Structure 1
């Protein structure tokens, strides 16, 4: 044992409970380094001497930043294979999803209500939604990843046409984050937004923002390819000094002792099949998740960035 060093983009309080439980079960000391927007630079600068064991981050774009900075090592683990569905881990064994986040469509509770069953992201590009849609910058990773999935499913031409239609329907210049779009729904600026599911929980947890969530309905797209999921996950650092402990830790985080808790704390979904979401998350509804591999989203990420620039999505 001795220890394991977790460099985390995610705030320590959102990961500490499961790490404390791991410590109790194994006797392995878990050190948390809050690398924040750090994280690649810090580990790269620390180089061969870096104590980093587990790199914990959020969004496939950040996972790819780590992999593409040559900071990952390949891990062969039957536990990770069994616990994590293949779509939420690397076929090339360098990264592993631990939770998912759904990119959903929020609607005005009063002015729209629940979306009809069958509603797709694609429907937001239809002319009837002109002036009614709020989305943050198209270059934001949450959106680029969604568009990358669309490239996989539909190709660049159809995705480009979608982006053009979506742009045409925006109520305002893309601005702010996902929560800001729901604030805009609350204030009647728009009736539809795209945003991550977990924000609904985060807003309800906040005294000011709860009214934003209360004015909106969370809708899980239910077209052909269902609801887009992105991930939080982990990578074992290239120069991990406590590799065995590190692998033990991520195996633990992938399993039934940690999955429910970790997802619950973050209002996310567990990756491990059979683990329930929290009561609050479950209450938002059940839905079909896209089966697309996150590595295929990563593959199309650059093309999606290119398409966003081509259509000048943020230009109003």
Structure 2
């Protein structure tokens, strides 16, 4: 019969792979796009909510669904054996589907082969760093992971040193980092790797490709692995088609689905041995932080408050 996917990810990132699942399985997939307030919509629909699988971005949003009571635990050897333990919740409460690594954009010819996140605070980078608002979720997640690894005192000192090094105010978006490296305003900056997948895959004759051509990616590590946030999913608490919900979620970590899933937004697949987009592969080997990503949610509010303490966006 059917399965209903409630997703905050644009249906066009996933429709082809959902259509393949439906064709092959004979299960009709109902795609329900929920731009924001997913927790609130599912809770309000109550015990008879049609939702089977909940899909969103950011570990914090996923944990909010779990803590908000709109998921259920599942047991699946398929999911547990595919998704690394640090990227899934205990007792099958939530599961990562792709990785969103926060990396260093670097002027294409700068002599810089490797980096630790801490290096961004080195005094020698003064006037040479671009970044978006410190309060943006991409940044608060990185700060939260830094507290988890290195503690609040070290994290505050890093924030103050990075602030001091900014070439311009912490504002704009991640792609603006590439724009401003091209423009000579900065030499390096922190921004997510998938945007470089977008820019470098853009056709020549676009500003996007000009920005992509100006930079290379260096993936920093904790001084160690690279910081990742995730997209992910969970089975809804009152799923009316529970068996099909588990079938769909297991499909979403299958090799064919993962190949398409990650390529769609140039993200990194969670499943090992999946063919990467050529640009993404060019970034070189990814070492993923062993930190449980749930730690990012644990330290998120502390991180945001530290960013505000230091006046990072001033």
CA distance in 2, matches of 1:247, 1:20: 17
Any residues of structure 2 matched to 1:269-280 within 5 Å, and which? 269-280=268-279
- 1:258 counterpart SS class: helix
Can you list the C-alpha shifts for 1:162-217, whole angstroms capped at 9, x where unaligned? Answer: 11111111111111221122212222221111111100011234433111111111
Aligned partner of 2:159 in structure 1 is 163
- 1:209 counterpart SS class: helix
Can you list the C-alpha shifts for 1:6-52, whole angstroms capped at 9, x where unaligned? Answer: 11111111111211111122111111111122422322222223211
1:175 paired residue among 165, 171, 176? 171
- 1:235 counterpart SS class: strand
CA distance in 2, matches of 1:174, 1:50: 41
Aligned partner of 1:46 in structure 2 is 45
Q: TM-score, normalised by structure 2?
A: 0.94
Cα shift at 1:225: 2.2
CA distance in 2, matches of 1:104, 1:114: 16
CA distance in 2, matches of 1:201, 1:114: 22
CA distance in 2, matches of 1:180, 1:138: 15
Cα shift at 1:300: 1.6
Range with bigger deviation, 100-109 or 40-49: 40-49
Q: Are 1:247 and 2:246 counterparts?
A: yes
1:201 paired residue among 197, 203, 211? 197
CA distance in 2, matches of 1:268, 1:114: 26
Aligned partner of 2:307 in structure 1 is 308
* Alignment check: 8 A CA contact 1:104 1:196 kept: yes
Q: Are 1:190 and 2:189 counterparts?
A: no
* Alignment check: 8 A CA contact 1:85 1:273 kept: no
Can you list the C-alpha shifts for 1:75-134, whole angstroms capped at 9, x where unaligned? Answer: 121111111111111125321001111110001224xx25233x1111010111111111
Q: Are 1:284 and 2:283 counterparts?
A: yes
* Alignment check: 8 A CA contact 1:198 1:266 kept: yes
CA distance in 1, matches of 2:192, 2:258: 19
Can you list the C-alpha shifts for 1:137-166, whole angstroms capped at 9, x where unaligned? Answer: 111111111111111111111111111111
Range with bigger deviation, 275-284 or 288-297: 275-284
CA distance in 2, matches of 1:8, 1:279: 27
CA distance in 2, matches of 1:91, 1:306: 28
- 2:224 counterpart SS class: coil
Aligned partner of 1:124 in structure 2 is 120
Q: TM-score, normalised by structure 1?
A: 0.93
